[PDB]
Structure 1
Amino acid sequence: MKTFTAKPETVKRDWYVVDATGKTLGRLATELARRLRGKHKAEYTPHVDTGDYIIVLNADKVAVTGNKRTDKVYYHHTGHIGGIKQATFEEMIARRPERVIEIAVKGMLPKGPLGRAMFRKLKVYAGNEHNHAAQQPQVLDI
């Protein structure tokens, strides 16, 4: 006998909403990565993406503990010489809030075409209104 593996056309998608207002960032990222990876299901398989579609609401109110709010600094190199640029958390929120949670969960996901396919499902919003009521995303209230 062989072990059962999942197929691509025998996947059951689900949709959910998570509200990150007043929640810590990393601890939220861990569960987000778990759910998008699908290790929370009973038919998990490592070469197939079966995570839910999570909609994060209120991404401009992510709570960060301690002094990280002003010491946690981001880095990214453009490619040119001396082209290293940085941005503090205190200003990254005011510039592009959703990118905070986006980058924080990307590094927790795996890398490869499936790694990117998995990130394609996450949807992050700074506001609190969303036009996805057509898909009836049941709130994962915590």
Structure 2
Amino acid sequence: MKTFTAKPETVKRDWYVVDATGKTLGRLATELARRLRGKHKAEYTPHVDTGDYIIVLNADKVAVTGNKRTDKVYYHHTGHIGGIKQATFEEMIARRPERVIEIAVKGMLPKGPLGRAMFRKLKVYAGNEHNHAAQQPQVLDI
């Protein structure tokens, strides 16, 4: 009698919708990564993706405490000598607010082919509308 393992051709998934108005950026992003991976189920298997799909609405109304609204900084390099760029938290909210939620979640997920496929189940919107009514998402209070 070996331990039960889950099979990718048999896992059942659901659809959920959450809105991020006035919610702390890092405490919201921790619950999102827990369900994109499947840790909330009794069938969790480390090499199989058993999570759910989530829609996140109102991405530009998320919150940060302290002085993080003006002091938090995002860095990246372009691959050319001297190509170090940067932007502040409020700068990116005005330019593409979706990238803020996705950068936080992506760093809390595993690194590898399976971690990349987990990310593909997240749908983030800056407004209050979505075009996924045929999948019938249900309300989750994260």
Band the TM-score falls in, shorter-chain normalisation = over 0.9
In structure 1, C-alpha distance between the alignment counterparts of 2:32 and 2:99, rounded to whole Å: 15
Segments of 5+ residues of structure 2 without an aligned counterpart are none
Quote the offset at 1:118 in angstroms.
Answer: 0.2
In structure 2, C-alpha distance between the alignment counterparts of 1:56 and 1:50, rounded to whole Å: 19
In structure 2, C-alpha distance between the alignment counterparts of 1:117 and 1:79, rounded to whole Å: 26
In structure 1, C-alpha distance between the alignment counterparts of 2:51 and 2:4, rounded to whole Å: 18
Q: What aligned pairs does 1:44-83 form with structure 2 within 5 A after superposition?
A: 44-83=44-83
In structure 1, C-alpha distance between the alignment counterparts of 2:84 and 2:58, rounded to whole Å: 30
In structure 1, C-alpha distance between the alignment counterparts of 2:9 and 2:132, rounded to whole Å: 23
In structure 2, C-alpha distance between the alignment counterparts of 1:48 and 1:67, rounded to whole Å: 40
Quote the offset at 1:4 in angstroms.
Answer: 0.2
Instruction: Name the SS for the 1:110 alignment partner.
Output: coil
Instruction: Name the SS for the 2:26 alignment partner.
Output: helix
Quote the offset at 1:50 in angstroms.
Answer: 1.2
Segments of 5+ residues of structure 1 without an aligned counterpart are none
Instruction: Name the SS for the 1:94 alignment partner.
Output: helix
Structural RMSD (CA)? 0.7
Per-residue deviation, residues 6-61 of structure 1 (Å, max 9, x unmatched): 00111001000111000000000100000001001010000011111000010010
* TM-score normalized with structure 2 length: 0.98
Moved beyond 3 Å, runs of 4+: none
Instruction: Name the SS for the 1:40 alignment partner.
Output: coil
Instruction: Name the SS for the 2:74 alignment partner.
Output: strand
Instruction: Name the SS for the 1:60 alignment partner.
Output: helix
Match of 1:140 in 2: 140
In structure 1, C-alpha distance between the alignment counterparts of 2:51 and 2:94, rounded to whole Å: 30
Quote the offset at 1:107 in angstroms.
Answer: 0.2
* TM-score normalized with structure 1 length: 0.98
Match of 2:11 in 1: 11
Quote the offset at 1:141 in angstroms.
Answer: 2.8
In structure 2, C-alpha distance between the alignment counterparts of 1:139 and 1:131, rounded to whole Å: 15
In structure 2, C-alpha distance between the alignment counterparts of 1:141 and 1:131, rounded to whole Å: 20
Q: Percent identity?
A: 100
